[PDB]
């Protein structure tokens, strides 16, 4: 039979301003009557890790993509979500710390609404003898309110282009690190997960705007 001799190859184009627009090549069965090639390829997703997109950044902070459409034998993908790796997420979890969680829904400038998370670990100071390093839980509730509050006035006034440009240097984590030190010296605050739960419209014109 040899179905892979009949199968077709489409190359995947990442959206703009990461550094590049190359991901890989995927298999398409072929177009045959009802089963058009642009049917399942629109529903296919991708899950790619860095040091190839963000111009030599850290190896973690993975990205979840989804293919919007295809245009001239080149399937163009769009942002779907953002995760971190299992070894990084299970790492920096010490038995003698306090792990502070946060999560918030927020709508962007356009019709995209998202759900983003936040993780925080305690930090032992320089020349500290007490090995426990816990809190009073009132500062923990206050810092959950604070990290819920910061993400509102970033992501509410900014759509996908500006929030991806803010997630390029992890400026949200550095902003929480800067505004965090008055309460507690919290160690490597990341967002650890964000996923898209509602998508308004196809918007090929907005995809052309995303191209620029």
């Amino acid at each position: 039979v040899d179905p892979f001799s009949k199968k077709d190859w489409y190359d995947v184009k990442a959206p703009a301003m990461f550094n590049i627009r190359n991901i890989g090549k995927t298999l398409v069965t072929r177009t045959q009557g009802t089963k058009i090639a642009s049917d399942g390829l629109k529903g296919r997703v991708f899950e790619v890790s860095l040091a190839d997109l963000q111009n030599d950044e850290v190896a973690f902070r993975k990205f979840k993509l989804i293919t919007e459409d295809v245009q001239g034998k080149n399937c163009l993908t769009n942002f779907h979500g953002m995760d971190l790796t299992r070894d990084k997420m299970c790492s920096m979890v010490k038995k003698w710390q306090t792990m502070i969680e946060a999560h918030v829904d927020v709508k962007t400038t356009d019709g995209y609404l998202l759900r983003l998370f936040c993780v925080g670990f305690t930090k032992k100071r320089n020349n500290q003898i007490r090995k426990t390093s816990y809190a009073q839980h009132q500062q923990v509730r206050q810092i959950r309110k604070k990290m819920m509050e910061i993400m509102t006035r970033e992501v509410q006034t900014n759509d996908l282009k500006e929030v991806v440009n803010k997630l390029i240097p992890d400026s949200i984590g550095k902003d929480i690190e800067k505004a965090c030190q008055s309460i507690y010296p919290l160690h490597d605050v990341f967002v650890r997960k964000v996923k898209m739960l509602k998508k308004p419209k196809f918007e090929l014109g907005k995809l052309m705007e995303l191209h620029g």
């Binding site: 892979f4 001799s5 199968k7 190859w9 995947v12 991901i23 890989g24 090549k25 995927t26 298999l27 399942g40 296919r44 997703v45 991708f46 899950e47 790619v48 890790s49 040091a51 190896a59 790796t85 299992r86 070894d87």
Partner: protein, 136 residues
């Protein structure tokens, strides 16, 4: 056939899922999307004995068969995802993964970054073994 890419210097990537358990080892080759299975050879497809399909000797045969089919179908590099029975069973992988990684790295199949995407539950759902569980 030539397939994806001519004028070599650029790699064609594929996701290699390795599902290792205490009873069987799965090696599976997919594209970067996740739908199009390129090759899939289990332990029982290469070993006639049912008690030796979990052995690392099965992993060498299955991984060499999959690496031969991938070189026939023309894909260069692999991003290896590693997983085990992690829902309620032991989260550590079985004896097949230690041999499968070596057998993929031995005969071609340039390895990118390896990420252990293992299904970890939230808060320890109900275990199959019962109250006092496995005995001898």
């Amino acid at each position: 056939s030539l397939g994806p890419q001519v004028a070599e210097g650029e790699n064609v990537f594929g996701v290699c899922h390795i599902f290792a358990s205490f009873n069987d080892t799965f090696v599976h080759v997919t594209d970067l999307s996740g739908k199009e299975t390129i090759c899939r050879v289990t332990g029982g497809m290469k070993v006639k004995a049912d008690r030796d399909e979990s052995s690392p000797y099965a992993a060498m045969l299955a991984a060499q068969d999959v690496a031969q089919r991938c070189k026939e179908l023309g894909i260069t590099a692999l991003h290896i995802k590693l997983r085990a029975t992690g829902g309620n069973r032991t989260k550590t992988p079985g004896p097949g993964a230690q041999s499968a990684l070596r057998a993929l790295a031995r005969s071609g199949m340039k390895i990118g970054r390896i990420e252990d995407v293992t299904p970890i539950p939230s808060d320890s759902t109900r275990r199959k073994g019962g109250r006092r569980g496995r005995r001898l």
